[PDB]
Every structure is written in C-alpha cells, then in structure tokens.
C-alpha cells in the first residue's frame, strides 16, 4: 500500500538503584531513566 510509516526506535534507558546503605536497610527504589511509567 502506498502509505508512509514513521519508525521510532523501541524505548530503552539506564536503570539506577536508589539505596540507603546495606548497613542500614535493604529496601531499594528503582529509577528507570527517561521512560514513561506506562512503558515499564
């Protein structure tokens, strides 16, 4: 079909782990860099 399709690359980004020292606790909060929350 004579139609034009734009191509956007699939989302990616770094993963960072915000963490208080292991010596204190072990809960972590994961930051996914530059991705809208729906895409996770």
């Amino acid at each position: 079909t004579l139609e034009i399709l734009d191509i956007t690359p699939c989302s990616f980004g770094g993963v960072s782990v915000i963490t208080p020292g292991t010596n204190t606790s072990n809960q972590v909060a994961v930051l996914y860099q530059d991705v809208n929350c729906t895409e996770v």
Binding site: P9, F12, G13, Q33, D34
Partner: peptide
C-alpha cells in the same frame, strides 16, 4: 543561547528555576 543510538542526556540536579532562586 541556542539521537537514539544509546546516547542519553541526563538532566541537571539544580533546575534553572532553583538556580534563579539562588
């Protein structure tokens, strides 16, 4: 004062508004 190959541009920690407040 004036792509998607793995290159990323992280944002600064102090936003321009906060710098203006300083």
């Amino acid at each position: 004062v004036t792509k998607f190959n793995g290159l990323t541009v992280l944002p600064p920690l102090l936003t321009d508004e906060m710098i203006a407040q300083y």
